Amino acid sequence: KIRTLQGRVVSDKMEKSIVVAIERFVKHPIYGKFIKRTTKLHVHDENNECGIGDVVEIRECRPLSKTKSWTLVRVVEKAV
Amino acid sequence: SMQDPIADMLTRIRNGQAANKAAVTMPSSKLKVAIANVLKEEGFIEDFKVEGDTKPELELTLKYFQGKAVVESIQRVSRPGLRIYKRKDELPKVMAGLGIAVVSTSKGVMTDRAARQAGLGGEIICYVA
Amino acid sequence: ELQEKLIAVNRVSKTVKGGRIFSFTALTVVGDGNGRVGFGYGKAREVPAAIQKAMEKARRNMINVALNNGTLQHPVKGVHTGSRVFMQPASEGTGIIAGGAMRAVLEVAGVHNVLAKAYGSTNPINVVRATIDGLENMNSPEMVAAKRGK
Amino acid sequence: MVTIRLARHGAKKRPFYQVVVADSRNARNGRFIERVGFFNPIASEKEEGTRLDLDRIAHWVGQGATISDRVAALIKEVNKAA
Amino acid sequence: ATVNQLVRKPRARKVAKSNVPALEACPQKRGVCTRVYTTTPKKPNSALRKVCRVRLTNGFEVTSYIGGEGHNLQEHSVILIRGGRVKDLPGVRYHTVRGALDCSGVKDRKQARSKYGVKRPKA
Amino acid sequence: ARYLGPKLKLSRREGTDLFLKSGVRAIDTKCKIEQAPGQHGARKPRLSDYGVQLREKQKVRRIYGVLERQFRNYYKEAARLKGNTGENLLALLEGRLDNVVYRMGFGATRAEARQLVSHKAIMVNGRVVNIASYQVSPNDVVSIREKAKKQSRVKAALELAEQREKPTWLEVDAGKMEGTFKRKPERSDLSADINEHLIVELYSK
RNA sequence: UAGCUAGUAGGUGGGGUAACGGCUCACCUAGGCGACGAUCCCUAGCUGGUCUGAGAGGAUGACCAGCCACACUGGAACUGA
RNA sequence: CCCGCAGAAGAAGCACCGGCUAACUCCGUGCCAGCAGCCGCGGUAAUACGGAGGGUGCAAGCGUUAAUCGGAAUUACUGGGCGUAAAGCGCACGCAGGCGGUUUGUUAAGUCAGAUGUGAAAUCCCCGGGCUCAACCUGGGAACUGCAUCUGAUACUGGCAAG
Ligand SMILES: [Mg+2]
Ligand SMILES: [Mg+2]
Ligand SMILES: [Mg+2]
Ligand SMILES: [Mg+2]
Ligand SMILES: [Mg+2]
Ligand SMILES: [Mg+2]
Ligand SMILES: [Mg+2]
Ligand SMILES: [Mg+2]
Ligand SMILES: [Mg+2]
Ligand SMILES: [Mg+2]
Ligand SMILES: [Mg+2]
Ligand SMILES: [Mg+2]
Ligand SMILES: [Mg+2]
Ligand SMILES: [Mg+2]
Ligand SMILES: [Mg+2]
Ligand SMILES: [Mg+2]
Ligand SMILES: [Mg+2]
């Protein structure tokens, strides 16, 4: 099996390229309170199949290019 | 607004206790019951009932030993906007043992002691001593 | 039988038409050695007179604290005025580790091993009264059983 | 060059070499791969004074590891058959 | 003061500045000693506390009191600074180490000899 | 160091006989014990809560001859020990070889025993030792070097040993200058008008 | 210090490297980063640990060991695993 | 390291003593000389200046200086406050964000449990050893409060469905 993070697409204006955000809880290293952090990755969408807002899922892979090392596996929602 | 129903229940008891009020009432709910149950099984409240059909109530009877009340202190712990989860080897020891700490475990809402023995951790709820 | 510990004494004054008027005030506590203490505060023109009369107040009207062995039945957190006090039972041999007025009462009370730390107002007059109230909160295990079970 | 040698870890005049599998390039008391057995050039007929753990030693030696003239001697000085 | 607040704006420490900038947090500094005064103390007290303006190595023309009765610092007298503010003397936050460098030591001193630099009298 | 000075003086301050001059006769008097530890000793000052502790601590310290530093470390142990710092400290002291030797007749006074130890006159378990602060474990046999067992001081020491008390926790065959270390002296047989806690607290001020 | 960024961000191709890759170049698109704080400025080698503290924490990073960087200063290759 | 050889011989000093703080008197001096961390000492009987006598503390060290933590619950996660002491935006609407009444089901992300990797060795800690002891050295375990994977548990929080 393999690890894959699913997140909402925040940007889709590049060729085959797509920016995706990923929220993630986290206990404060001194306050306990869990904070919702987000990460911005530039996934690879060679088919442009997924669009903006589309909750897509991706996995880590070979560095397809600078600031780019993740490829879209499959869409999980065609945006609201 | 009621952003924490659990707190209300707790405060309702301590406020009543000091008020000598015979018993206390409030809208019940699965969790409220579990807590009230532990409070009874441990000897902090005489008993407790849940009236109403479409609108659940909760006839929680308070307990008073001598010329004083049993619940000398009861405060909330794992409140909202700041949850608290412990491990089997973490559960707090209320009043060096003379007290109890209601902790919700994956097996149910039990007392600190029981949970610690069952070897499972959970979410604290209050420190009734 | 009766331990007499003199916490501290102050001068204090009272100005009048003629001028200031010197005086005195002594703070002391009387403990039996097992489970009875009682702070007595008294004032008088003479430094000694105040103490002697302040002792009576101490002896009379004391208190019975359920002391388990030589320590506290459990950690308490008494308080009074702007003086917050935290008392915690120590192991056998840890010795009495407390501030000024703090120990004065814990010693005559019968306590021998407790590591308590008081904070807020360090004033004796209020510390001791707060410390005493603390020991009064700690309930014995058998007492806890009296509450529930039944 | 992965080999097995000794490393001084005792006080002045009173050493205490430690047999460990490391990389030749790395300094003596430097970085190693895994500490395998120990040695003591003092003792006091303390019933103990030299370890080795043949099993572990074997794995490395058979995988291309070497052995320092000293440590190598130890392996034999001790009835290795048992 | 809810958690959130602190999470967005953590508690702030402070930056207690050295009451005596003898620089590099040095136990002592050397100076050329520009001038030597005898200014008067503050309000409650009254005397002629003997101070002197020293020119530290790093270039920090400061002042420093001369403990002990009688000294010998003149013009270009190389001395060492210890660092010990004097209340009755404002601006004076350092103390000239006695017995060191060009600075002599209190003579006829017996009790408390270490201070004011004084070797054992005799026997 | 080892103080090396007016031993009686020390006993005058504490207001008791630390056995620093455990000679034959004497024992109080011939020094004016409890009269004035000094020139102004005549006055009876009021010891402060702190002083009460600093004195209680100072006394027990000079009894074994141990100085501050060394003593300090002993306390550090008494605490880290899985037992009771109180007893632990006293025991840690009693374990001292220089102390053990004393309590076994050898050497009239502890200060005297010290010399026997330092001068290779003592031997623990078929082994010579000259470290006064040597910790004596149980079962250990405290004996004297023959080239020193026929010494004068030795016998003279045991002359009043039997006259004095008895260590109810260790054997000692005066015949061939022996001394087995049965076991640690319980808080009881080691007790006295010495309450340690008073000091164990002073080390937490 | 509130805006930063053209080989900038991505895409095709050729080239290049031990190797993935704007690493490189021509062409195309108009993108990429930022208050979850970019850019700018000042200060600093990082860690295991060390000191203090009841702990949480605070202050640190000498000796010992892991990693990194530098070798008169600035720059450049050669040989070579 | 052992054996022997004289002979107490070759080896004690530093700070302080008004309160905090353990330790007091006499001279001299006379808001001068001087002390001093703070409060404060000195203007003819100074326990506070300088010396002496005595005492206290520490010891081949002692004292001062510099600097970090402590005390400081004085940046307060544990562990504080805002009527008058410092402190409620002059007041509303509201995006982001934080928090969310009640029931059943479902999911299993947080959460809990079990295990597997890994978290270098040395420190630290417990037990045990070795240099006469100690410092020091060392065997084993513990701990490394963490990250990831896997297998479960489903009370609570989160998602989804129907209310
Ligand atoms: Mg200073
Ligand atoms: Mg290409
Ligand atoms: Mg190509
Ligand atoms: Mg630098
Ligand atoms: Mg603290
Ligand atoms: Mg160069
Ligand atoms: Mg005093
Ligand atoms: Mg002085
Ligand atoms: Mg005079
Ligand atoms: Mg703090
Ligand atoms: Mg304070
Ligand atoms: Mg405040
Ligand atoms: Mg005002
Ligand atoms: Mg105001
Ligand atoms: Mg208003
Ligand atoms: Mg390790
Ligand atoms: Mg749910």
Over the Cα atoms of chain B, what is R_g?
14
The token duo for F168 is 């109810």
Task: Count CB-CB contacts under 10 A for residue E63.
Answer: 22
SS3 E43: coil
Which residues in chain E have their CB less than 8 angstroms from residue B81's CB?
Answer: 2-4
Nearest to F176 by CA among F137, F139, F153, F150: F150
What number of CA atoms fall less than 13 Å from residue B65's CA on the CB side? 15
The span from the CA of F105 to the CA of C51, in Å, is: 52
What number of CA atoms fall less than 13 Å from residue F96's CA on the CB side? 24
What number of CA atoms fall less than 13 Å from residue E97's CA on the CB side? 16
Q: What sign for the dihedral angle of Cα C71, C74, C80, C85?
A: positive
CATH architecture, domain defined by F7-93+190-203? Orthogonal Bundle (1.10)
Which nucleotides in chain H lie closer than 7 A to a protein CB?
2-4, 12-17, 20-25, 31-42, 50-60, 62-68, 72-77, 80-82, 97-104, 109-114, 120-121, 125-127, 129-139, 148-150, 152-157
Nearest to B122 by CA among B82, B100, B96, B91: B91
- Residue span of the structural domain in which E94 resides: 1-123
Q: Which residues contact F189 (CB under 8 A, 6 or more apart)?
A: F167, F168, F169
Strand partners, A63: none
The token duo for C140 is 């014995």
- Given a contact cutoff of 8 angstroms between Cβ atoms, the answer to whether B121 and B88 are in contact is yes
Within E1-123, residue ranges assigned H as helices are 3-8
Token pair 């911005």 is found at: A40
SS3 D43: coil
Q: Which residues contact E60 (CB under 8 A, 6 or more apart)?
A: E21, E23, E29
SS3 D40: coil
Nearest to F117 by CA among F133, F140, F105, F103: F133
SS3 A2: coil
Token pair 């936050």 is found at: E93
- The CA–CA distances, whole Å, from F182 to E35, E65, F26 equal 76, 65, 32
The token duo for C146 is 């009296």
**After which residues does chain F show a gap where C to N exceeds 2.5 Å?**
none
Query: What's CA A10's distance to the chain center, in Å?
Result: 9
- Given a contact cutoff of 8 angstroms between Cβ atoms, the answer to whether B76 and B104 are in contact is no
The token duo for B25 is 């009432």
Tell me whether residues B84 and A32 touch, CB distance under 8 A: yes
Q: What is the CATH number of the domain that holds E60?
A: 2.40.50.140
Token pair 């010290």 is found at: F114
The span from the CA of B15 to the CA of C17, in Å, is: 52
User: Position B77: which residue type?
Assistant: V
The span from the CA of F52 to the CA of F63, in Å, is: 17
The span from the CA of C37 to the CA of C16, in Å, is: 37
Answer whether any strand H atom is within 7 A of the Cβ of E93.
Answer: no
Helix (H), strand (E) at residue A73: strand A68-75
CA angle at residue B54 from B53 to B60, to 5 degrees?
55
Strand partners, B48: B60
- Given a contact cutoff of 8 angstroms between Cβ atoms, the answer to whether C102 and C85 are in contact is yes
Token pair 């040993």 is found at: F161
Query: What's CA D45's distance to the chain center, in Å?
Result: 20
Helix (H), strand (E) at residue F9: helix F7-14
The span from the CA of C31 to the CA of C63, in Å, is: 9
Within chain C, residue ranges assigned H as helices are 47-59, 100-109, 124-135, 141-147
Q: Which residues contact B9 (CB under 8 A, 6 or more apart)?
A: B26, B32, B35, B36, B58, B60
- Residue span of the structural domain in which A73 resides: 1-80
Strand partners, C119: C84
Domain ranges of chain B: 1-71, 72-129
The token duo for D45 is 């007929």
The token duo for F48 is 């402060």
Q: Secondary structure of chain B in the HEC alphabet?
A: CCCCHHHHHHHHHHHHHHCCCCEECCCCCHHHHHHHHHHHHCCCCCEEECCCCCCCCCEEECCCCCCCCCCCCCCECCCCCCCCECCCCCCCCHHHHCCCCEEEECCEEEEHHHHHHHCCCEEEEECCC
* Protein-to-nucleotide distance from the CA of A55 to the C1' of G9, whole angstroms: 22
- Given a contact cutoff of 8 angstroms between Cβ atoms, the answer to whether B96 and B75 are in contact is no
Tell me, in Å, the resolution of the deposited structure.
3.2
What number of CA atoms fall less than 13 Å from residue D30's CA on the CB side? 8
Helix (H), strand (E) at residue D5: strand D2-5
Domain ranges of chain F: 7-93+190-203, 94-181
User: Position C119: which residue type?
Assistant: Y
Q: What is the DSSP letter of E89?
A: B
CA angle at residue B121 from B120 to B126, to 5 degrees?
135
Q: Are strands C96-97 and C114-115 parallel, antiparallel or unpaired?
A: parallel
Q: What is the DSSP letter of E49?
A: -
Total domains present in chain A: 1
Backbone dihedral angles phi then psi of residue C52, each to the nearest 5 degrees: -50, -45
- The CA–CA distances, whole Å, from C88 to C85, C96, C106, C142, F133 equal 10, 11, 12, 19, 37
Q: Which residues contact C80 (CB under 8 A, 6 or more apart)?
A: C126, C129, C130, C133
* Protein-to-nucleotide distance from the CA of C124 to the C1' of H98, whole angstroms: 44
What number of CA atoms fall less than 13 Å from residue F2's CA on the CB side? 14
The token duo for F14 is 């504490």
The token duo for B43 is 């000897």
The span from the CA of E33 to the CA of F190, in Å, is: 65
The token duo for C114 is 């407790």
Tell me whether residues B43 and C75 touch, CB distance under 8 A: no
- The CA–CA distances, whole Å, from F42 to B77, B122, F12, F14, F36 equal 63, 70, 11, 14, 5
| Helix axis angle, F110-118 to F152-161, nearest 10° | 150
In the CATH scheme, what is the code of domain F94-181? 3.10.290.10
Q: In the structure, how many helices (H) and strands (E) does chain E have?
A: 1, 5
Task: Count CB-CB contacts under 10 A for residue B72.
Answer: 18
Q: Is B81 on the interface with A (CB under 8 A)?
A: yes
Token pair 């388990």 is found at: C68
Q: Which residues contact F45 (CB under 8 A, 6 or more apart)?
A: none
The string of DSSP codes covering A6-22 is EEEEEE--SSSEEEEEE
Answer whether any strand H atom is within 7 A of the Cβ of E89.
Answer: yes
What number of CA atoms fall less than 13 Å from residue F172's CA on the CB side? 18
The span from the CA of E91 to the CA of E88, in Å, is: 10
Longest dimension (CA), chain D: 36
Q: What sign for the dihedral angle of Cα F59, F165, F187, F81?
A: positive
Q: Are strands E29-31 and E35-36 parallel, antiparallel or unpaired?
A: unpaired
- Given a contact cutoff of 8 angstroms between Cβ atoms, the answer to whether D50 and D40 are in contact is yes
Q: In the structure, how many helices (H) and strands (E) does chain A have?
A: 0, 5
Token pair 């209050």 is found at: B126
CA angle at residue B13 from B7 to B15, to 5 degrees?
95
The token duo for C94 is 């840890």
User: Position B126: which residue type?
Assistant: C
Backbone dihedral angles phi then psi of residue A56, each to the nearest 5 degrees: -100, 170
Q: Which residues contact F23 (CB under 8 A, 6 or more apart)?
A: F108, F109
- Given a contact cutoff of 8 angstroms between Cβ atoms, the answer to whether D21 and D68 are in contact is no
Q: Is C139 left (phi over 0), alpha (psi -120 to 50) or beta?
A: beta
- Given a contact cutoff of 8 angstroms between Cβ atoms, the answer to whether C37 and C108 are in contact is yes
User: Position D2: which residue type?
Assistant: V
Answer whether any strand G atom is within 7 A of the Cβ of D8.
Answer: no
The token duo for F106 is 């050898």
Q: Which residues contact F82 (CB under 8 A, 6 or more apart)?
A: none
In the CATH scheme, what is the code of domain B1-71? 3.30.1370.30
Q: Which residues contact B71 (CB under 8 A, 6 or more apart)?
A: B13, B14, B17, B44, B45, B62, B63, B128
- Given a contact cutoff of 8 angstroms between Cβ atoms, the answer to whether A10 and A50 are in contact is no
Nearest to D49 by CA among D81, D12, D19: D19
Backbone dihedral angles phi then psi of residue E78, each to the nearest 5 degrees: -65, 125
Task: Count CB-CB contacts under 10 A for residue D28.
Answer: 11
Q: What sign for the dihedral angle of Cα E113, E114, E116, E120?
A: positive
Give the neighbours of chain B: at least 3 Cβ pairs within 8 Å. Answer: A, C, E
Q: What is the DSSP letter of A36?
A: -
CA angle at residue F133 from F132 to F137, to 5 degrees?
105
The ligand whose atoms approach the alpha carbon of C118 most closely is: 11
The span from the CA of B66 to the CA of C90, in Å, is: 30
For C80-113, b/e burial (b = at least 16 CB within 10 A) is: beebbbebbbbeebbbbbbbebbbbbbbbbbbbb
In the CATH scheme, what is the code of domain B72-129? 3.30.1490.10
Nearest to D56 by CA among D73, D33, D78, D39: D33
The token duo for B75 is 């405060």
Helix (H), strand (E) at residue C5: strand C3-10
Which nucleotides in chain G lie closer than 7 A to a protein CB?
9-12, 20-23, 28-34, 36, 54, 56-59, 64-67
Q: Order of strands across the sheet with B23-24?
A: B23-24, B59-61, B47-49
Query: Residues E123, F5, F8, F14: what is their CA dihedral angle, to the nearest 10 degrees?
Result: 100
The span from the CA of E82 to the CA of E104, in Å, is: 15
Burial of E51 (0-12, 13-18, 19+ CB in 10 A): buried
